[PDB]
């Protein structure tokens, strides 16, 4: 497929067709890829400046006993490092519903949690995994 | 409510829920949407399911779209074929990647979309 | 690789050379395989028959913070339905430094745990791919 | 135990008594932790000057059956970005049989790779949770 | 070597190509790929084929993928439900958008890939 | 719009009201339909019988350079095949002028041309949607 | 014909003759061309200032369930691009009747909707085809 | 879907995934459209800047006796005032099997005829239809 964004070793894919969640995930897999994670400032930047004013799925889900994030990934989260970028006063987990994130806002203080059976667009992330000539 | 088998405890859902929200449920409650990996677990399920239908942990997973399931016990192609309805998986529409517990036979599962609500059942590890 | 050996679903490889636990799942991961589990009773049997009287690791390990056993391959790990199948008396932790699973004796009691990092032959298991 | 040291978002244990690659992964996980991972060089930085001249097992290990290397906490290893902390001319594979990493240099080119088997002091990283 | 019927002739190939670049084979001879009206049409087709598959000019159209004929004749779905194989159209991978002659029975149609090359068969119209 | 008669998977309209043929053809577009054209001999059966032995436009016309004959909906116009559904002696282009065609007499020779702006009543199909 | 005016890739044919619209797109056909559409202001402009400020029917025609105007040359019909060309008012449906459209105003404004059954000379277009 | 771009009356789709001639016409299709035709010098302008360097099918194919070129979308194909499309010396009929044509070169002149069962990423053409409010 064309729309592989390369950076830093990875490639993004920015879906044109929205899906919940996991359905968003399973499409990910398929593409032997996962949402996307999230772990540096340069990174978040990327998405969300290719993101423009559009919604989209990122790995962030709730796992475990107590609903911690997490990242589907399996990449370990970081709630420290991980706190500039949400937005002000997410998660907000409205309706005790909120379960998923998304990267919503222009700002590298761009994340939401929403319902995780809302339909959004997605962002899938692949591994480069290059090798001597 | 949770019914104790074979060193696993099983929670059959009174409320249905998308396939991944019953996962996350399950999680909540330190389990996994069940696996199904003998004879004997199969007839359990279905005979406890009473005629209705239940998710279980089977979703699709790589490029080539092999089924696997989320507690991570490895799926086994060959010992699992007898535990699908004939003609199952057929994916229709080609966006049925789940599996629940339909028929009430060793030949119980069906395919079917991911974002459809059912009953679940989860599987709950027992430590002595 | 050849000399793998076929049951319900799986190739399962008896090494000829020793190695520690994980460098045993090392090698066998370089086969697109793990050490392997064991979940009935007919697979304990192919095994133990198999062994021959002789000593292999299979993939138990002690992981989590209460060291409860586990299986390298991630099947979940069912205490209940595999007390049946350690030597009596294991898993005794010798020295407080068994951490890692073997296949001791040609019994349905068959398994022992010893030292991770003691060198035994040792049993891979890949899944049969159509 | 006291001696774990902080650094964004983590908390890292530098051990005093040497084990195994895999022995040492056993004593993270029995203290809710991994061996640790290296993702920025500010990360690698703190590890090999606090490593202060010493060899400590880290988190690398091969996976798959290609033996691309990995990390054991499960953090997705990026093969693009990491190249820059290997030590000039590693993983070279010793004897066939290195498939296992350390921090050896005291440089931000720091990593060798070794034979699994060999015991070395080892380092410990999980994520605070608050 | 066209063989003539009820006011069309009809060409089998000796040639398999994908199933456009046969309609634009017989679109060069002033036909297009055959659509099938009646059970008489049917028949002399599945008998004619010899028990070969052939291309016909089945092929999907509209969002919601009704099937229909290159050759403009409107596509008739309870007419014509009787001349698919039983299971058929399964669209297998999803990627099924075209239709051949496959069984030498009235139950005669699959759905195949579009750009599988098959042996066709073109329609061309008698005007006397 | 009501007053549609289902037969093998197509419904059918005759009208109470006559149009020229193309504004009948216009009327029965806005009702998702076309004049209806007419391929088989149950069809024409069908159509010459509901019809009662009173005049209605269906689908005939003629298109490109030789006048041949056409149907509205598409379908391929068999000129053997159809034959025997005219009157004898149609189509008979009086005064070079009858550039479509009606149903006149009820039997299966039941076609007549005539000329395409005068007005008759008009046979709308439209295909049954499942 | 040896009335044949030649723009853009096509050529015209202004008719002396005044038919109803349908039959005026018979004619057409009859001379291996349609009614014509307009596609571009140039076109809009040859085609209104040829006409001198008499009437022609051009091939707009409603089509599909909605009634939404076609080309019955097949161009798909540019609702967006074509707004432009119509009289300030029209289409306005007259009477309910008006399903056929021609050009009547000496203006780039100049189509009007009118009765298919009115009588009116007629403008054929057929592209130059080598 | 996402990725439709407007312009001048009708939406274009650039497509991600390459295909066959007639299976990328097949997509334009269940998605209520056609492989684009090209009938101005600003839609063709839109379409290969927008291409940049990758090659796109378009709606032109041959068909009736002659093998005349014409668009899929029943758009009658003025040949003169086409010329100005073509790459030039295009079209050249490679090996007599070039009878579908993609949009090539990064110019004004950008067509080339290439076998219609080769495949290539593929541009769909959809109508816009206002009403008034
Ligand atoms: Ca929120
Ligand atoms: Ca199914
Ligand atoms: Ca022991
Ligand atoms: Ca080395
Ligand atoms: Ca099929
Ligand atoms: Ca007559
Ligand atoms: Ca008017
Ligand atoms: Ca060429
Ligand atoms: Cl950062
Ligand atoms: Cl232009
Ligand atoms: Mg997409
Ligand atoms: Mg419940
Ligand atoms: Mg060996
Ligand atoms: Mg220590
Ligand atoms: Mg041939
Ligand atoms: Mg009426
Ligand atoms: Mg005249
Ligand atoms: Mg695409």
């Known amino acids: ?21 996991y359905s968003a995930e399973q499409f ?17 930047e990327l998405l969300y400046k290719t993101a423009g004013g559009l919604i989209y799925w990122i790995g962030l889900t709730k796992a475990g006993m107590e609903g911690d994030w997490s990242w589907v990934d399996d990449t370990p989260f970081n709630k420290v490092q991980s706190a500039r970028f949400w937005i002000p006063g997410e998660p907000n987990n409205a309706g005790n519903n909120e379960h998923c994130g998304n990267i919503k806002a222009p700002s590298l203080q761009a994340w939401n949690d929403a319902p995780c059976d809302k339909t959004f667009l997605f962002i899938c992330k692949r591994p480069y995994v290059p090798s001597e000539p």
Chains 1, 8 share one sequence.
Do not use: A, D, M
């Open 28 to 44: 990910c897999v398929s593409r032997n890829s996962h949402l996307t994670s999230v772990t540096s400032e340069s990174e978040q």
């Open 1 to 21: 497929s064309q729309g592989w964004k390369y950076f830093k070793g990875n490639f993004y894919y920015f879906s044109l067709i929205p899906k919940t969640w």
